[PDB]
Design a protein around this ligand. Structure first.
Ligand SMILES: Cc1cc2nc3c(=O)[nH]c(=O)nc-3n(C[C@H](O)[C@H](O)[C@H](O)COP(=O)(O)O)c2cc1C
Ligand SMILES: Cc1cc2nc3c(=O)[nH]c(=O)nc-3n(C[C@H](O)[C@H](O)[C@H](O)COP(=O)(O)O)c2cc1C
Ligand SMILES: [Cl-]
Ligand SMILES: [Cl-]
Lengths: 122, 122
């Protein structure tokens, strides 16, 4: 399951990065720390406004990488911390996963990441 | 050159993300906004402590992506903005490129990103 310090990061402001595999190289997009909705112990849901290239990539290769952190959360060896998340992604336009982020009226979909690993990298 | 909004983001707290092409898929690592040093119109330097997998990737494929942002900097549609940087990476252990981040006593190298494009994505 996702660790306690990860939830501490989610209580603080920051830029989340999401990497996917494209045809000619990686792609990299963003969301905000506060926009992530955790379901169960292994699902993270992100509201999707754009992410057209990201969605195309996920459709061909479900594997994604996600990073996030905060200067304001104590890490393993000093001030500040962050995480590398590895997981499989899918997009949903309806159902409970979309409803989890439906408060964002600009959302055309939900990006659902099923987390396989969470590594505290700082 | 890099736009003024980019420099304003650098003056604010945040997590930077750097994506490279690995053999099996993307790799994704981090630094801090305040760690970045802009050398001229199109070079950004990052202090390297770890980044061993990242360095190996860059040796195979120099192309990199970088994202950064801040809630505290104005975007197109209100508060909050960020950037996607596309460029090529090189690692240096001496010269002005290393001297630029030498204040970090833990730095084993400098990661020099030569920016091809900087897109404001919010
Ligand atoms: C700090 C930041 C937060 C962002 N938040 C979102 C978001 O929550 N959802 C979204 O779809 N795009 C968000 N964007 C824009 C995306 O990063 C991306 O540029 C856009 O969705 C287009 O994706 P694509 O290049 O895969 O087509 C954000 C950008 C930044 C810089
Ligand atoms: C918020 C944050 C800031 C980081 N800052 C640096 C940094 O400035 N330089 C560095 O080498 N690694 C930094 N790290 C660790 C790297 O992201 C990465 O995990 C480590 O360098 C190993 O890289 P590699 O997987 O390419 O071997 C930071 C991690 C986080 C979460
Ligand atoms: Cl946030
Ligand atoms: Cl910072």
């Amino acid at each position: 399951m996702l660790p306690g310090t990860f939830f501490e990061v989610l209580k603080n402001r920051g830029v989340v990065a999401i990497a996917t595999q494209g045809e000619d190289g990686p792609h990299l997009v963003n969301t905000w720390n506060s926009y992530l909705k955790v379901l169960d112990g292994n699902r993270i849901v992100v509201p999707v406004g754009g992410m057209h290239k990201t969605e195309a990539n996920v459709a061909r290769d479900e594997r994604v990488l996600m990073t996030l952190g905060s200067r304001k959360v104590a890490g393993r060896n000093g001030p500040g911390t962050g995480f590398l998340i590895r997981g499989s992604a899918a997009f949903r336009t309806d159902g409970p996963e979309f409803e989890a982020i439906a408060r964002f009226k600009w959302a055309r979909a939900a990006l659902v990441i099923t987390v396989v690993s969470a590594e505290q990298t700082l």
